Every structure is written in structure tokens, then in C-alpha cells.
């Protein structure tokens, strides 16, 4: 009787959506934990709330790729207090790495406390608009995840990609249309942001919206193909 099944995405499971807890016995944001013991074996999973995590919403909504997988090196822009980062940390595991970039010092304290238990998280308490200031800390990454909310933030993501993202690496970008231009339609916003990505050789491969978890919110996944 398999109680928790591997999901199509490596490192993700269905029980609904859960990740394997990198720190058994501890929750990050009050989420339920499910520990399964058989003999001397024991594995714990943490529930992943699509109402607080746009990545979980996107997975439940059927995104084809997330590019966050065991061993991956991830640059996470807008890490906040670490809710989604904690699950990314679970997925990439001890051989992966998550750079958790966050501008707020208050949020940063939560990220620092989270990363005390998780070796694979590096809090970077800096303004992502100016990646030259922390470039010496960031090893080249496989995937960038970003929470974009202003009409200048796709460009911020791109500037980080140009500095940190490997050729042929990937990006996963959440777009809150209301925050980019509340006077535009969600479709005008999403089309405009996709255009900004393409201008920076960030080539979308898929996109989806996040109902019923969020209103007028899209996740765009794609591939970075800079010129020589
Ligand atoms: C909550 C939050 C979101 N965010 C998004 C960006 C980027 F501009 F890189 F997209 C940076 C941040 C950040 O420091 N905090």
C-alpha cells in the first residue's frame, strides 16, 4: 500500500502535494508533516500549500517542467521568509544549492533561521536590482525562480540571468498582473512580460495561470539562450 507516491516531478510526491523533509521533525510555516515508518526505515514528508506557494499551484495546475530537481543549483529571487524556498531546498537535496535572495531584513531573519538547519540554503539579503554587489557569492546556477510584481522586475530577473544563469539553463517566473499594471488586462500584462523576456533571450516554453489558487497570476517557464 503506497501511501505517498512519487510525482511526475522528481523530488515531488502526492499523498495532496508534499516534499521529502530535509529536516525531519520540523515544520517551517505550520504545514502538516507525515512520517512513514516501516521496520528500521523512516521517511517524513511536508505538505506544500498551493495557496501560499505559487510553485505548488503551478505544479497542481499541470506545468510540464519545473527544472528544480535533485542536485540543482537554484537562484531564488524574492525568497521572502522562505516558504517556497523550504520546498525547493527539500527537492534539490543535500547535493543541491538554493540562493535565497531577499531585500527585506525582517524576512531575511526568517531566511537565516531557516538556513541554520538546511545546509543547502544560502540567504543573500540584498537588492536583486544590483547583482554586481553580490556576484562574488553566487556560483553559476541551473535555474532562476522569481516572484515578479513590478514593471521593472522582469528586467531585474534578466540582469541576474545574464550574470548568473548558465547557457541553456531555465527560468520559472511568477507574474502577478495586478501588481505590474493594474490598468492593463491580465492578458496585456502577460504578453508584455513575455516580450520583455524574449528581448533578453529568455525564451518561454510554457505558461499557465494559477486558478483556483490565485487570480490573474501566471507562471512562465523557459530556457535562457544568450548570444556569444
Ligand atoms: C518578495 C520579494 C520579491 N522579489 C522579486 C524580485 C526580483 F526583482 F528579482 F524579481 C526581488 C524580490 C525581493 O527582494 N522580495
UniProtKB/Swiss-Prot annotation:
UniProt keyword Ubl conjugation, yes or no: yes
A Gene Ontology molecular function term of the record: U6 snRNA 2'-O-ribose methyltransferase activity
Numbered residues of crosslink Glycyl lysine isopeptide (Lys-Gly) (interchain with G-Cter in SUMO2): 20, 42, 54, 69
Disulfides per UniProt: none
Helical as annotated region, ranges: 185-217
Reaction(s) catalysed (UniProt annotation): L-glutaminyl-[histone H2A] + S-adenosyl-L-methionine = N(5)-methyl-L-glutaminyl-[histone H2A] + S-adenosyl-L-homocysteine + H(+); a ribonucleotide in rRNA + S-adenosyl-L-methionine = a 2'-O-methylribonucleotide in rRNA + S-adenosyl-L-homocysteine + H(+); a ribonucleotide in U6 snRNA + S-adenosyl-L-methionine = a 2'-O-methylribonucleotide in U6 snRNA + S-adenosyl-L-homocysteine + H(+)
Localisation: Nucleus, Nucleolus; Nucleus, Nucleoplasm
Binding residues for S-adenosyl-L-methionine: 83-84, 102-103, 127-128, 147-150
Keywords: Acetylation, Isopeptide bond, Methylation, Methyltransferase, Nucleus, Phosphoprotein, Ribonucleoprotein, RNA-binding, rRNA processing, S-adenosyl-L-methionine, Transferase, Ubl conjugation
EC numbers for this chain: 2.1.1.-
PTM field: Ubiquitinated. Ubiquitination leads to proteasomal degradation. Deubiquitinated by USP36. By homology to other fibrillarins, some or all of the N-terminal domain arginines are modified to asymmetric dimethylarginine (DMA).
Predominant location category: nucleus
Gene Ontology biological process terms in this record: box C/D sno(s)RNA 3'-end processing; osteoblast differentiation; ribosomal small subunit biogenesis; rRNA methylation; rRNA processing; snoRNA localization
GO cellular component: box C/D methylation guide snoRNP complex; Cajal body; extracellular exosome; fibrillar center; granular component; membrane; nucleolus; nucleoplasm
Chain positions with Phosphoserine modification: 27, 35, 37
PTM sites of type N6-acetyllysine: 32, 116-117
Source organism, top-level taxon: Eukaryota
Quaternary structure and partners: Component of box C/D small nucleolar ribonucleoprotein (snoRNP) particles that contain SNU13, FBL, NOP5 and NOP56, plus a guide RNA. It is associated with the U3, U8, U13, X and Y small nuclear RNAs. Component of several ribosomal and nucleolar protein complexes. Part of the small subunit (SSU) processome, composed of more than 70 proteins and the RNA chaperone small nucleolar RNA (snoRNA) U3. Interacts with PRMT5 and UTP20. Interacts with DDX5 and C1QBP. Interacts with NOL11. Interacts with PIH1D1. Interacts with RRP1B. Interacts with NOLC1. Interacts with SDE2. Interacts with NOP2 and NOP56.
Family: Belongs to the methyltransferase superfamily. Fibrillarin family.
Function: S-adenosyl-L-methionine-dependent methyltransferase that has the ability to methylate both RNAs and proteins. Involved in pre-rRNA processing by catalyzing the site-specific 2'-hydroxyl methylation of ribose moieties in pre-ribosomal RNA. Site specificity is provided by a guide RNA that base pairs with the substrate. Methylation occurs at a characteristic distance from the sequence involved in base pairing with the guide RNA. Probably catalyzes 2'-O-methylation of U6 snRNAs in box C/D RNP complexes. U6 snRNA 2'-O-methylation is required for mRNA splicing fidelity.
Protein's UniProt name: rRNA 2'-O-methyltransferase fibrillarin
Chain's gene name: FBL
Boundaries of the shown chain within the full protein: 85 to 317 of 321
Amino acid at each position: 500500500n503506497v501511501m505517498v507516491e512519487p510525482h511526475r516531478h522528481e523530488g515531488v510526491f502526492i499523498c495532496a502535494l508534499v516534499t521529502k523533509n530535509l529536516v525531519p521533525g520540523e515544520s517551517v510555516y505550520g504545514e502538516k508533516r507525515v512520517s512513514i515508518s516501516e521496520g528500521d526505515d523512516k521517511i517524513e514528508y511536508r505538505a506544500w500549500n498551493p495557496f501560499r506557494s505559487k510553485l505548488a499551484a503551478a505544479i497542481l495546475g499541470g506545468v510540464d517542467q519545473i527544472h528544480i530537481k535533485p542536485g540543482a543549483k537554484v537562484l531564488y529571487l524574492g525568497a521572502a521568509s522562505g516558504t517556497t524556498v523550504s520546498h525547493v531546498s527539500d527537492i534539490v537535496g543535500p547535493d543541491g544549492l538554493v540562493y535565497a535572495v531577499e531585500f527585506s531584513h525582517r524576512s531575511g531573519r526568517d531566511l537565516i533561521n531557516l538556513a541554520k538547519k538546511r545546509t543547502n540554503i544560502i540567504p543573500v539579503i540584498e537588492d536583486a536590482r544590483h547583482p554586481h554587489k553580490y556576484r562574488m557569492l553566487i556560483a553559476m546556477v541551473d535555474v532562476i525562480f522569481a516572484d515578479v510584481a513590478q514593471p521593472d522586475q522582469t528586467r531585474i530577473v534578466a540582469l541576474n540571468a545574464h550574470t548568473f544563469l548558465r547557457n541553456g539553463g531555465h527560468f520559472v517566473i511568477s507574474i502577478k498582473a495586478n501588481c505590474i499594471d493594474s490598468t492593463a488586462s491580465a492578458e496585456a500584462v502577460f504578453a508584455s512580460e513575455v516580450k520583455k523576456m524574449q528581448q533578453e533571450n529568455m525564451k518561454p516554453q510554457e505558461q499557465l495561470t494559477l486558478e483556483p489558487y490565485e487570480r490573474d497570476h501566471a507562471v512562465v517557464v523557459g530556457v535562457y539562450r544568450p548570444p556569444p
